[PDB]
Design a protein around this nucleic acid. Structure first.
Ligand SMILES: [K+]
Ligand SMILES: [K+]
Ligand SMILES: [K+]
Ligand SMILES: [K+]
Ligand SMILES: [K+]
Ligand SMILES: [Mg+2]
Ligand SMILES: [Mg+2]
Ligand SMILES: [Mg+2]
Ligand SMILES: [Mg+2]
Ligand SMILES: [Mg+2]
Ligand SMILES: [Mg+2]
Ligand SMILES: [Mg+2]
Ligand SMILES: [Mg+2]
Ligand SMILES: [Mg+2]
Ligand SMILES: [Mg+2]
Ligand SMILES: [Mg+2]
Ligand SMILES: [Mg+2]
Ligand SMILES: [Mg+2]
Ligand SMILES: [Mg+2]
Ligand SMILES: [Mg+2]
Ligand SMILES: [Mg+2]
Ligand SMILES: [Mg+2]
Ligand SMILES: [Mg+2]
Ligand SMILES: [Mg+2]
Ligand SMILES: [Mg+2]
Ligand SMILES: [Mg+2]
Ligand SMILES: [Mg+2]
Ligand SMILES: [Mg+2]
Ligand SMILES: [Mg+2]
Ligand SMILES: [Mg+2]
Ligand SMILES: [Mg+2]
Ligand SMILES: [Mg+2]
Ligand SMILES: [Mg+2]
Ligand SMILES: [Mg+2]
Ligand SMILES: [Mg+2]
Ligand SMILES: [Mg+2]
Ligand SMILES: [Mg+2]
Ligand SMILES: [Mg+2]
Ligand SMILES: [Mg+2]
Ligand SMILES: [Mg+2]
Ligand SMILES: [Mg+2]
Ligand SMILES: [Mg+2]
Ligand SMILES: [Mg+2]
Ligand SMILES: [Mg+2]
Ligand code: NA
Ligand code: NA
Ligand code: NA
Ligand code: NA
Ligand code: NA
Ligand code: NA
Lengths: 64, 146, 208, 113
RNA sequence: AUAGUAUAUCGGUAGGGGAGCAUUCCAGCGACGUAGAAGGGAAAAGGGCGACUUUUUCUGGAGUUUCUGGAAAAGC
RNA sequence: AUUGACCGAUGGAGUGAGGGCAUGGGUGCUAAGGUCCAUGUCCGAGAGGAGAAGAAUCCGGACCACCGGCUAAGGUCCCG
RNA sequence: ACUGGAAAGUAUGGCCGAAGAGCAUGAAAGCUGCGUAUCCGACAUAUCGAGCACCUGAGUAGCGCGGGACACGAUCCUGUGUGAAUUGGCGGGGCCCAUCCCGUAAGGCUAAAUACUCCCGAGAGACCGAUAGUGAACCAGUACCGUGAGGGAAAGGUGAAAAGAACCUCGAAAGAGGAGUGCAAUAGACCCUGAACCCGUCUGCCUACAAGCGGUAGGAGCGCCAGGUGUGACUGCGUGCCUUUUGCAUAAUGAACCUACGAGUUACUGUUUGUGGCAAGGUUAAUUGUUAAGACAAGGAGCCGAAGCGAAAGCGAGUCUUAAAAGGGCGCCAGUCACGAGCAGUAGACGCGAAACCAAGUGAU
RNA sequence: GCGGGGAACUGAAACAUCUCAUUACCCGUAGGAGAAGAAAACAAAAGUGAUUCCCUCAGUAGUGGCGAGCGAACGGGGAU
RNA sequence: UAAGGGCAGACGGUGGAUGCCUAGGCUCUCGGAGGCGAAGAAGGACGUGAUAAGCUGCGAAAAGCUGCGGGAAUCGGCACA
């Protein structure tokens, strides 16, 4: 049958123009005052999935 | 000529066949290694599994929302308008754009500014970028949003 | 390419016909021919073959002997493939063998075979003929008069011609086809190709 | 279609069983015993092709030693005198000359002694 | 393998890659068979190498097969 | 200087029970064919020769054939 | 005419064909037989206007409490307790209100396009061919096993034709030797062919002072038929194979032997790649028409490519971040459809193997 | 086919929500088919009008110890 | 030398592989049909022959009885004598 997309991956990742995968950063949810502003600003940015994990993320999204 | 058919070189290839002796280099363990989960019949990969450590599709948060009234425009750039007109035209329109296979029938068109539109044209599109509209009007054209 | 036209008695009438150059004088694509013939034979297949797997055997699922203590090899149920009269593992299953070829690919392979015929000089154009009644001896005369009767020959006809079909049916090395249902396999399956002067016009408009 | 290579499968066994004729007991005709014995024998033959060159050179030297000693000279001193004089006759030729043509051997000795 | 005959290289388990043989059936062009087919016994000869192939003779008494392509119930 | 041994992209893996020896160490009793690390090496996945017979000590990396020659470690009274 | 036990074979020379499908006949038959193409046939039986406010479905719609179905852990159903209005009405448009739009619950009936095969008729297969294919080609759900529910085999072939061996010899007769039939009896009833393991007899060479995975490399003599073949006095070297292991002659695992059987397959959805078609475009799906399942022609719906950035509104070779900018992030500065192949997931998914769990029955001989 | 009842092994690499599955199985009862069926319907100022079945839409919108998983409709193209 | 044994060959025994073959299977396509039964069904028991175990057919009218249509020399089922 048809391949099924993982429901959690399709709410956490996105594709870019050249094929890289967009992602958010962790450690940004609730324990915030003790962290530095530089740390929090770096964590607020979007990032890309690492090369060693692209295969697993693509399998989760059905090679998308 | 059915007695002398031949396919192109390198077009057909024999399939791999495992577990049929030592000379093939694929017998015995038949490419599976020695023991463990991966050697058994019926093993399949658990796609998100990482051995028990919290997987990447769980360590990371969800983000965003999808708008149920989103509007998307098919981008038709400036250099296409001058190319199509000269090839085939001095008044471009959606029904003409569809007739030349450049856009589907039920699709909305916005004109952008990637190129030059030197030829003087009257243009009927659903949407126009600020720079794209100025490019036509400067080149002695007309812009009709409809 | 223009060819002379003969009558039933196999005598040139001076009248000539022209063959479209885009149909009969291209460079043949031999890989296109290979794929069209492979597809034709696959579409003729009827894959009605089957052997019984383990879940299809008539034996009971009961465990034959207790797991430990018997002194022999451990055994489950009577349908095991290791047993005499047991399950057949990975046997035939009913299959559909058809596959797709692009429409433009099939058109090119039709032209390559006709080009091969035109190049090997195995194309005869004969004037259109119709019999009053079915007679196998009548149709043998045309083949003997055209000097194509000792090897497989294909007759291309433009219309039904029921009388002609019945006259040529009993003869071993004779094949009849309609000019609009021409395919690659049937062209290459006969040494000689006999076109009627009205089948040329049909082919020229259709397979251009 | 169903494919079973009965004739071919059985022909492979029959060819090898011709090679195991002459063996002791079940090693000549019982298939899994005979094939085991034949395969082990082929390993011996690869090793014994090499040892043949060792055994035949040792036999040439022993015969040369006896022939030289009848003319008051050991093998080591005779060989040292030949290599000093540039004589390139090999040990197989000299041993043959020692055994079957003793007068020619005596001329080689008389040239270096 | 590189350069187009020269230089280098050729021990191998897990494992990756390349190139082939045999088997059953199909299409096409063709062959063989009661003046003896398949199968079975014996012998001889071949292959860069091999999986294997060919010939002769006895038995046997009716089917068998080259090449090119195609598909597998395709090898203990 | 170096037969080219390095890296990127992308298809396919296996492995994730190691072991001996030498050197530097911890632990143990300055015991263990013990145990835990580091640096090499060999066995693993490596045949041939010497050591009487020994996985890793000494010499040495097997494309095939040869009733040719030179050597290594180690030897040259006989078995040899 | 030849070969042959027997022509249908082979070589000549004819003929029919709307019939050159096939099966049978002493070998392989268009012209020997039954048939085939085509045409013709049933006594039976079977089937085929204005106004007006009168009406328009009640324990119903709706509601509380507890459950169920909807893709779903507003809409639909209801066990329990309640409970409207009436065309200016009532219900729905994903809490809810307003407006607008759509529709008329609490009555009912309806062909086609869809699902299936105990069965009848006509066909087919790059399906099996007697340890295969149904458990069952024969006798089969039989024999046999079980109190019962239930479980459940093995087993095809003389020959063209029984012409299935009158009669004799040895034997008390079982068995054979002959005779005869036959192309063949080493086709003689367990009968086509007739392999291996296993078992005999004969002939040739070796063997009673000799000690280890049984071979391998040398090497006399002897025996047969011109240098081939059988044997092997004597000599050198040599602790099977598989699997599992750091490491096995291992006193770790495994097999009596032979013949036969026995384990990465297929479908669908992706992805990479070898080979092709078309190319800023590529490609049809269901289905339809003609012809006679295939073949040819239609079918552009949809899908991918063609612009990105942003959570989004939205801007656009830019965009987001900023009060703005600079900086910075992401972008800008040949695809598509197939064929073959590798791999992945879903299916039992390379094969054999549990202890167990659940449902419906059978048993207190 | 339509009704009445209704598991567990298994997956979640444990397991209770969830899954297996409105399956297996048991019972009742039609027909050549059955069920459905003629809007108290969809839609979104643009429109289509009974039911059924196929191709798409789409592994999408959603749902979910937001885990494993589950998974539409509108619209378009057909059969009738 | 050979009580015995080893190897090779020749000829046999046993056994029933292999090759060839088919009488039975397997998967489907097209068309039809989709029931039988109180006027007693499905499924059975017992019988039934010149001869008669078992199957088949039949039912004390018992391998069968009467008409109508077909067809033309053999026939009393498998199945002999
Ligand atoms: K944990
Ligand atoms: K055959
Ligand atoms: K025999
Ligand atoms: K002796
Ligand atoms: K043990
Ligand atoms: Mg927050
Ligand atoms: Mg390997
Ligand atoms: Mg192995
Ligand atoms: Mg293993
Ligand atoms: Mg392990
Ligand atoms: Mg592993
Ligand atoms: Mg298992
Ligand atoms: Mg069971
Ligand atoms: Mg079977
Ligand atoms: Mg297979
Ligand atoms: Mg080397
Ligand atoms: Mg190598
Ligand atoms: Mg097999
Ligand atoms: Mg580990
Ligand atoms: Mg470890
Ligand atoms: Mg240790
Ligand atoms: Mg230490
Ligand atoms: Mg240890
Ligand atoms: Mg090494
Ligand atoms: Mg609303
Ligand atoms: Mg059977
Ligand atoms: Mg015979
Ligand atoms: Mg026989
Ligand atoms: Mg002594
Ligand atoms: Mg151990
Ligand atoms: Mg290992
Ligand atoms: Mg050892
Ligand atoms: Mg022992
Ligand atoms: Mg064990
Ligand atoms: Mg044992
Ligand atoms: Mg053992
Ligand atoms: Mg064994
Ligand atoms: Mg065995
Ligand atoms: Mg679990
Ligand atoms: Mg009924
Ligand atoms: Mg209906
Ligand atoms: Mg024999
Ligand atoms: Mg047989
Ligand atoms: Mg009458
Ligand atoms: Na292996
Ligand atoms: Na013969
Ligand atoms: Na076998
Ligand atoms: Na900026
Ligand atoms: Na003797
Ligand atoms: Na009566």
């Amino acid at each position: 049958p048809k391949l099924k997309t993982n429901s959690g991956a399709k709410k956490r990742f996105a594709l870019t123009g050249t094929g890289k995968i967009k992602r958010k950063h962790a450690f940004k949810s609730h324990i915030l005052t003790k962290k530095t502003k530089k740390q929090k600003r770096n964590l607020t940015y979007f990032s890309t999935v690492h090369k060693v994990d692209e295969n697993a993320v693509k399998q989760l999204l059905c090679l998308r | 000529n059915l007695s002398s058919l031949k396919p192109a070189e390198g077009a057909v290839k024999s399939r791999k066949r495992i577990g049929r002796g030592p000379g093939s280099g694929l017998g015995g363990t038949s490419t599976r290694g020695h023991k463990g989960a991966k050697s058994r019949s019926g093993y399949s990969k658990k796609i998100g599994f990482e051995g028990g450590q919290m997987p990447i599709q769980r360590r990371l948060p969800k983000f965003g929302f999808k708008n149920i009234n989103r509007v998307e425009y098919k981008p038709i750039n400036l250099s296409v308008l001058q190319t199509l007109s000269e090839a085939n035209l001095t008044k471009i329109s959606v029904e003409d754009l569809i007739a030349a296979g450049l856009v589907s029938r039920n699709s909305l068109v916005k004109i952008l500014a990637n190129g030059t539109v030197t030829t003087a044209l009257t243009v009927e599109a659903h949407a126009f970028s600020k720079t794209a509209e100025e490019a036509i009007v400067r080149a002695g054209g007309s812009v009709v949003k409809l | 390419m223009e060819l002379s036209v003969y009558n039933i008695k196999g005598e040139d009438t001076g009248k000539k016909v022209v063959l479209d150059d885009s149909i009969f004088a291209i460079e043949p694509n031999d890989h296109a021919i290979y794929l069209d013939v492979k597809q034709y034979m696959a579409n003729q297949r009827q894959g009605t073959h089957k052997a019984k797997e383990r879940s299809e055997l008539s034996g009971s699922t009961r465990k034959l002997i207790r797991q430990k203590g018997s002194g022999g090899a451990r055994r489950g149920d009577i349908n095991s493939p290791l047993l005499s009269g047991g399950a057949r593992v990975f046997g035939p299953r009913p299959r559909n063998y058809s596959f797709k070829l692009n429409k433009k690919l099939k058109a090119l392979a039709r032209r390559s075979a006709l080009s091969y015929k035109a190049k090997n000089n195995e194309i005869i154009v004969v004037e259109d003929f119709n019999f009053d009644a079915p007679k196998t001896k009548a149709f043998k005369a045309i083949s003997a008069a055209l000097k194509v009767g000792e090897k497989k020959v294909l007759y291309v006809l433009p219309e039904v011609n029921k009388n002609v079909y019945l006259s040529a049916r009993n003869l071993p090395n004779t094949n009849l086809i309609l000019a609009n249902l021409i395919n690659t396999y049937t062209v290459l399956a006969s040494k000689n190709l006999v076109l009627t002067e009205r089948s040329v016009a049909v082919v020229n408009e259709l397979f251009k | 279609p169903r494919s079973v290579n009965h004739v071919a499968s059985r022909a492979k066994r029959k060819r090898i069983l011709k090679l195991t004729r002459g063996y002791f007991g079940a090693r000549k005709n019982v298939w899994t015993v005979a094939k085991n014995t034949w395969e082990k024998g082929l390993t011996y033959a690869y090793r014994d092709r090499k040892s043949k060159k060792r055994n035949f050179r040792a036999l040439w030297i022993q015969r040369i030693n006896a022939a030289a000693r009848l003319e008051g000279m050991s093998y080591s001193r005779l060989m040292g005198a030949l290599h000093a004089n540039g004589i390139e006759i090999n040990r197989k030729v000299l041993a043959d000359l020692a055994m079957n043509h003793p007068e020619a051997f005596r001329a080689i000795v008389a040239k270096v002694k």
